[PDB]
Write an enzyme that holds these catalytic residues in place. Structure first.
Site, PDB file in Angstrom:
ATOM      1  N   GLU A   1       0.794  -1.225   0.000  1.00 53.33           N
ATOM      2  CA  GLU A   1       0.000   0.000   0.000  1.00 53.33           C
ATOM      3  C   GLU A   1       0.829   1.279   0.000  1.00 53.33           C
ATOM      4  OE1 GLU A   1      -3.222   0.056  -0.394  1.00 53.33           O
ATOM      5  OE2 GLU A   1      -3.695  -2.073  -0.013  1.00 53.33           O
TER       6      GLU A   1
ATOM      7  N   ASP B   1      -6.493   6.140  -4.887  1.00 51.75           N
ATOM      8  CA  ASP B   1      -6.046   4.758  -5.009  1.00 51.75           C
ATOM      9  C   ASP B   1      -6.088   4.322  -6.473  1.00 51.75           C
ATOM     10  OD1 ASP B   1      -8.688   3.999  -5.563  1.00 51.75           O
ATOM     11  OD2 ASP B   1      -8.983   2.915  -3.691  1.00 51.75           O
TER      12      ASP B   1
END
Ligand SMILES: CC(=O)OCc1ccccc1
Ligand SMILES: [Cl-]
Length: 162
Positions: free
Chosen positions: A11, A20
């Site tokens: 991440e 994202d």
């Protein structure tokens, strides 16, 4: 390696609101804020999550705090889910990390279509499960991350993260 290190690799860490891979406002170590296109909506979610007026920026300590909460929420969601819990409890610790990783990324609803993959994992048919897991939107949209997670399920080792 452990689940925190694994997801920190997958991440990253960003201290300002970002988008994202799906275009959704996120912060920290992959903390989804909202699917709304409104940056103001994302900022409200952030302030609610942190407990102060952040105007879109957090500290590393705050990012790590949110991350711990998010990992724990994924684990407890697995343990409360009648479909996922039996599979999870059949796995060794390394493969349990791969399981948490998927739930962190996609949520319980995002893994709902993985019924056949789940069966293969519970049967410990690792190569077969790996082939089946790659037949997914997940793999096609985030192939390098999915390949790492799938290798973890296939081998029961941390080799893809070393
Ligand atoms: C559904 C999936 O393929 O990954 C999430 C998962 C896997 C095994 C056990 C619990 C959750
Ligand atoms: Cl990827």
């Amino acid at each position: 390696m452990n689940i925190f290190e694994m997801l920190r690799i997958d991440e990253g860490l960003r201290l300002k609101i970002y988008k994202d891979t799906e275009g959704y406002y996120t912060i920290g170590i992959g903390h989804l804020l909202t699917k709304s296109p409104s940056l103001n909506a994302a900022k409200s979610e952030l302030d609610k999550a942190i407990g102060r007026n952040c105007n879109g920026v957090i500290t590393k300590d705050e990012a790590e705090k949110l991350f711990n909460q998010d990992v724990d929420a994924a684990v407890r969601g697995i343990l409360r889910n009648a479909k996922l819990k039996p599979v999870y409890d059949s796995l060794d610790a390394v493969r349990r990390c791969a399981a948490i990783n998927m739930v962190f990324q996609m949520g319980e609803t995002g893994v709902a279509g993985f019924t056949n993959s789940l069966r293969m994992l519970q049967q410990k048919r690792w190569d077969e499960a790996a082939v089946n897991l790659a037949k997914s939107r997940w793999y096609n949209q985030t192939p390098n991350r999915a390949k790492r997670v799938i290798t973890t399920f296939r081998t029961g080792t941390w080799d893809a993260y070393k």
